[PDB]
Structure 1
């Protein structure tokens, strides 16, 4: 599913992500636009052989099992394919674990390079929240 901007904000808000670990909703919507374009089905391969899955491009070296990333962990205890659902629950739940891990949202490269330090409240402007 390809979300609209406000539709995804609302979804993220309902799943408790606004101000999770001190990260406002705009930061999460901005991260999702630059990671996936707001596509749940987005997959990207990494040079190391791991793969990033879903709206928030979560990586199978640490976080999910895809059966084809040797030696990897599965901290979120989910198949990577479940990160591709139209229902974002599993992605949000796993992203709460990731941002908790010590580096905050800097775990998402496109957040650090394209969202950090910018006016991220623009990403939720206009929305009925």
Structure 2
């Protein structure tokens, strides 16, 4: 599923993402936008370490989900990486929440630091009714 901007904002808000661990909805929107373009089926193989990024948040197989083919990987979200490729983002959101419960918070995603941190991210949620 490729979400439309405001449709996703409300979906994330409805799922409890607005202010989760101090993270505004606009930050999640900026993350989802830069990681996958709001695409739940997005996948990216990392040849460098044999791991794969899955879904709308592009969560990694080394630490967060199990895909059975990542060497020495763990599964902190306790989910099949397949769960992160659904049109329904509830599982991806549960895992995204799990990621930020760790010290780094939203900083876990390199793309957020690069394209969202210390930036004006209001545009991602303007006019969405959130």
TM-score by length of 1: 0.98
Structural mapping, 1:1-129, within 5 Å:
1-46=1-46, 47-129=48-130
Structure 1 residue runs without a partner (length 5+)? none
What do you get for the CA RMSD once the two structures are aligned? 0.7
State the aligned residue count: 129
Pairwise CA distance, 1:26: 0.1
SS in 1 for 2:13: helix
Pairwise CA distance, 1:128: 2.1
SS in 1 for 2:44: strand
Structure 2 residue runs without a partner (length 5+)? none
Q: Tell me which stretches of 4 or more aligned residues in structure 1 moved more than 2 Å.
A: none
Q: Aligned partners of 1:109 and 1:86: how far apart in 2?
A: 24
Q: Aligned partners of 2:113 and 2:76: how far apart in 1?
A: 22
